[PDB]
Amino acid sequence: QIVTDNSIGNHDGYDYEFWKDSGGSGTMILNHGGTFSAQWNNVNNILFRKGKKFNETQTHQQVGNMSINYGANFQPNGNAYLCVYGWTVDPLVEYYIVDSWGNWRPPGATPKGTITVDGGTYDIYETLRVNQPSIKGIATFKQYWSVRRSKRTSGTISVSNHFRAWENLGMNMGKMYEVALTVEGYQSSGSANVYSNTLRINGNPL
Numbered sequence: 239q240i241v242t243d244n245s246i247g248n249h250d251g252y253d254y255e256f257w258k259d260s261g262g263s264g265t266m267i268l269n270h271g272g273t274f275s276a277q278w279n280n281v282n283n284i285l286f287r288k289g290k291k292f293n294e295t296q297t298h299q300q301v302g303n304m305s306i307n308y309g310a311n312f313q314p315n316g317n318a319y320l321c322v323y324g325w326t327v328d329p330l331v332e333y334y335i336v337d338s339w340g341n342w343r344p345p346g347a348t349p350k351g352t353i354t355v356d357g358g359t360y361d362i363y364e365t366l367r368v369n370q371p372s373i374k375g376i377a378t379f380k381q382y383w384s385v386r387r388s389k390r391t392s393g394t395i396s397v398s399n400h401f402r403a404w405e406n407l408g409m410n411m412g413k414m415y416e417v418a419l420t421v422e423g424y425q426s427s428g429s430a431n432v433y434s435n436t437l438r439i440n441g442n443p444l
């Protein structure tokens with residue numbers, strides 16, 4: 239259950255993944271249920287996550303309501319995100335619902351709107367990745383974002399409400415590929431202890 243290089247699998251019912259590009263190091267310890275700890279040092283880009291991977295046949299509406307209850311001790315030293323993250327396919331989209339960050343509030347673009355949900359206010363953004371790594375090879379794809387206006391590191395994220403807001407703004411979504419509580423680091427070091435992470439689909443825990 240010690241993961242220090244790229245790996246995808248299932249641990250205690252959750253689909254976990256460790257992903258990094260070259261350089262630096264990271265360690266992910268897979269703990270009970272959706273929980274895990276992460277540490278990273280001198281990386282270029284690293285992501286640690288536990289959630290659900292899907293078989294690319296259903297819209298978010300067809301999967302049903304997705305909600306994540308979480309808590310994490312988030313200790314970045316530099317740039318990092320604490321978020322819900324995942325992908326759709328057809329179209330290929332990477333997405334983020336960011337509740338906390340390190341020194342830099344992402345994603346550096348002009349907001350397209352705002353959503354109020356889960357006691358917070360989130361700015362909504364759309365950015366572009368050109369010829370970058372993806373779940374479907376080197377690709378050009380949009381990134382969709384909801385970013386909280388102030389940081390928090392525990393609570394509930396009503397994922398499907400974000401998806402409805404994005405679609406209302408014309409941020410087209412494809413078939414679900416993944417939804418997961420994620421820690422991302424960029425050109426930084428840090429640690430995170432995700433001590434609570436429960437994904438419920440239609441009110442039922444994974």
Ligand SMILES: *[C@H]1OC[C@@H](O[C@@H]2OC[C@@H](O)[C@H](O)[C@H]2O)[C@H](O)[C@H]1F
Pocket residue numbers: 255257285332367370371372373381
């Ligand atoms: C958002 O997160 C990092 C990266 O996505 C990874 O692409 C490679 C794939 O194997 C992993 O599962 C993904 O996390 C993407 O370039 C970036 F936009």
